[PDB]
Amino acid sequence: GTILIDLSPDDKEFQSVEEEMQSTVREHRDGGHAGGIFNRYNILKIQKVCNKKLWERYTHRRKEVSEENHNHANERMLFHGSPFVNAIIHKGFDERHAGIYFAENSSKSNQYVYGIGGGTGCPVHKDRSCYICHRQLLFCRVTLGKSFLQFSHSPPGHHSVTGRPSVNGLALAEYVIYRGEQAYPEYLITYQIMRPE
Numbered sequence: 001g002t003i004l005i006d007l008s009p010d011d012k013e014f015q016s017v018e019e020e021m022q023s024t025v026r027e028h029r030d031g032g033h034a035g036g037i038f039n040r041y042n043i044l045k046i047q048k049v050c051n052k053k054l055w056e057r058y059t060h061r062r063k064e065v066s067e068e069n070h071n072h073a074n075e076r077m078l079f080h081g082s083p084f085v086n087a088i089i090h091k092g093f094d095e096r097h098a099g100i101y102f103a104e105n106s107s108k109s110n111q112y113v114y115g116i117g118g119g120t121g122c123p124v125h126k127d128r129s130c131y132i133c134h135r136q137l138l139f140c141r142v143t144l145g146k147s148f149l150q151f152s153h154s155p156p157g158h159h160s161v162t163g164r165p166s167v168n169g170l171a172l173a174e175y176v177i178y179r180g181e182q183a184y185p186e187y188l189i190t191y192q193i194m195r196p197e
């Protein structure tokens with residue numbers, strides 16, 4: 001079902017997606033332990049993810065949410081890092097793998113590409129701060145609907161949870177959904193973290 005369409009660096013769609021990647025990098029409280037030490041990425045490839053069934057599933061649910069929330073899907077574009085990115089682009093998101101988490105900060109999602117807290121890092125060097133091995137992240141279209149505000153299935157009468165960072169100073173929000181149909185994996189981004197100079 002799924003085809004991946006390569007986007008050219010000269011395409012405005014490539015450029016807008018890359019800019020969201022780069023401009024949402026932040027410093028983390030672990031000093032780079034989980035995701036590595038970097039201020040920007042080397043973008044190697046951006047692919048548009050096209051799948052008819054997963055898209056129709058996304059839009060059907062989006063309409064339901066919208067009608068339960070004064071015609072407002074509250075749709076966002078958010079990052080998702082996972083060792084299971086290949087399964088996600090072909091089979092879509094699945095809540096049973098308790099919710100499904102998404103980040104406004106690309107560098108937050110980058111912490112989860114090799115597993116929880118970075119796991120043991122890249123397969124070949126076992127380095128969580130590897131500047132060599134290629135990483136992959138999803139930039140996803142996400143339906144939040146009526147989102148339950150959390151100061152840091154979904155709560156009754158809500159479609160999602162918003163984790164508003166209270167303690168952290170420069171952190172952006174993180175979101176949780178409980179229905180896999182409320183997220184569509186729209187862009188597959190292949191990159192390296194870049195060593196600072």
Ligand SMILES: CNCc1ccc(-c2[nH]c3cc(F)cc4c3c2CCNC4=O)cc1
Pocket residue numbers: 079080081082098099101102103104108109110112116173174175
């Ligand atoms: C549920 N098992 C523990 C657990 C493991 C990972 C995550 C988690 N929190 C996130 C916040 C965020 F902004 C983005 C992500 C995550 C994840 C893992 C899923 N991917 C994310 O990018 C949450 C809970």
Ligand SMILES: [Zn+2]
Pocket residue numbers: 122123124125126127130131132133
């Ligand atoms: Zn490596």
